[PDB]
Amino acid sequence: RPVDQYSNQNNFVHDCVNITVKQHTVTTTTKGENFTETDIKAMERVVEQMCITQYQRESQAYYQRGAS
Known about the structure:
By secondary structure, the chain is mainly alpha-helical. It has a single domain, classed as Prion/Doppel protein, beta-ribbon domain (Major Prion Protein, Orthogonal Bundle). It has three helices and no strands. Helix 2 (9-30) packs across helix 3 (36-62). It starts with a helix and ends in a 6-residue tail after the last helix. Residues 37-55 form the Prion/Doppel protein beta-ribbon domain. One of its GO terms (molecular function) is metal ion binding.
């Protein structure tokens, strides 16, 4: 089952949330390059949930532990 997104949870959070931080910061940089730790910390909050949401999505996808 390719839902290892839950299985590797701790490593997933570190790695995925980082790359999603990159994602969100990138878009928020191209929005006119403003962001600022205010926006960026706020970004990372949504970002950790961004990858964690997708990780919940994986678990629900197979219904490994599930997610609802």
